[PDB]
């Protein structure tokens, strides 16, 4: 494992540190339905889920609080999600990976779960 997987982890550690106003919103849980898909499909799928999220919530009123601080936290949340998306996507190398599922999840648990999947992946290679 080279730097790509490492960046993904740091960003995750960073994101799981403090939760923001919109970390409660839900997203498709793609882990609770692991249908023995490839390692790639997962990365790609996770990228898709996150992409949809920042895509839909970037300019969300609820998320941008009432204080500058809530505002910056949200901007940053969005920033990091983009970093995750592009790295995870680069890692998979798939043009498309349909996320057909219905098991919802809180982004907070999604990131927390994903962080574990990534740290384990890292602990493997040497």
């Amino acid at each position: 494992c080279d730097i790509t997987l490492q960046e993904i982890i740091k960003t995750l550690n960073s994101l799981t540190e403090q939760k923001t106003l919109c970390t409660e919103l839900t997203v498709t849980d793609i882990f609770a339905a692991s249908k023995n898909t490839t390692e790639k499909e997962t990365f790609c799928r996770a990228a898709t889920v996150l992409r949809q999220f920042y895509s839909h919530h970037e300019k969300d009123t609820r998320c941008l609080g009432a204080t500058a601080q809530q505002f910056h936290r949200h901007k940053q949340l969005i920033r990091f999600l983009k970093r995750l998306d592009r790295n995870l996507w680069g890692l998979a190398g798939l043009n498309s990976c349909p996320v057909k599922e219905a098991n919802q999840s809180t982004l907070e648990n999604f990131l927390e779960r994903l962080k574990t999947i990534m740290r384990e992946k890292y602990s493997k290679c040497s």
Binding site: K10, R86, G90, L91
Partner: protein
């Protein structure tokens, strides 16, 4: 047919933060800023293209600073150098494979204790940046009147500090210092030297 020509493959580096600088050489005297346009675009779905206006670097040399919102290892860019309607050159560039770190700053000298001399500086990157925790340094210390005798200390730990035993510093004179940085994890080159700092120790 092709009045304007790029002599050699253009070369770029990134500070891995906001900027990427490409350098290249033209076949003759050229007004870069007037004749050329470099269009870069991230290779990622639904991403727009950007236009950079080249600065001049010597009579037939050009340089251009591509501004980026963020940078991650996966990211790759398309580059298209135009001279009007004539594509001069086309290429790809992956920031994470050609990193040159920003020079460190705020080099200050501490002389409270007598045994050792303490040197501190600042790490140019924000803590949230992927390079922050990967930099190690090199401090350069020389005498003003006796530049001949200069030393280069290698700081191979994360803290931006250096301690040198004063038992190696001819008192009475004034020395100058400056520091640069690199990140082994990304196989980067050295940063530029930081502004220097002279001090007269006793």
């Amino acid at each position: 047919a092709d009045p304007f020509k790029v002599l050699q493959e253009p070369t770029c580096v990134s500070d891995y933060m906001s900027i990427s600088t490409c350098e290249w050489k033209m076949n003759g005297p050229t007004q870069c800023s007037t004749e050329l346009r470099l269009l870069y675009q991230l290779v990622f779905l639904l991403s727009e293209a950007h236009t950079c206006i080249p600065e001049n670097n010597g009579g037939a040399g050009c340089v251009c600073h591509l501004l980026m919102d963020d940078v991650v290892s996966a990211d790759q860019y398309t580059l298209d150098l135009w001279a009007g309607q004539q594509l001069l050159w086309k290429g790809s560039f992956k920031p994470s494979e050609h990193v040159k770190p920003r020079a460190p700053g705020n080099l200050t000298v501490h002389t409270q204790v007598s045994d050792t001399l303490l040197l501190t500086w600042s790490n140019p990157y924000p803590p949230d940046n992927y390079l922050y925790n990967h930099l190690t340094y090199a401090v350069n210390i020389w005498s003003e009147n006796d530049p001949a005798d200069f030393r280069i200390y290698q700081v191979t730990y994360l803290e931006p500090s250096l301690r040198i035993a004063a038992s190696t510093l001819k008192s009475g004179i004034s020395y100058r210092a400056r520091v640069r940085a690199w990140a082994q994890c990304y196989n980067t080159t050295w940063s530029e030297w930081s502004p220097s700092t002279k001090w007269h120790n006793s």
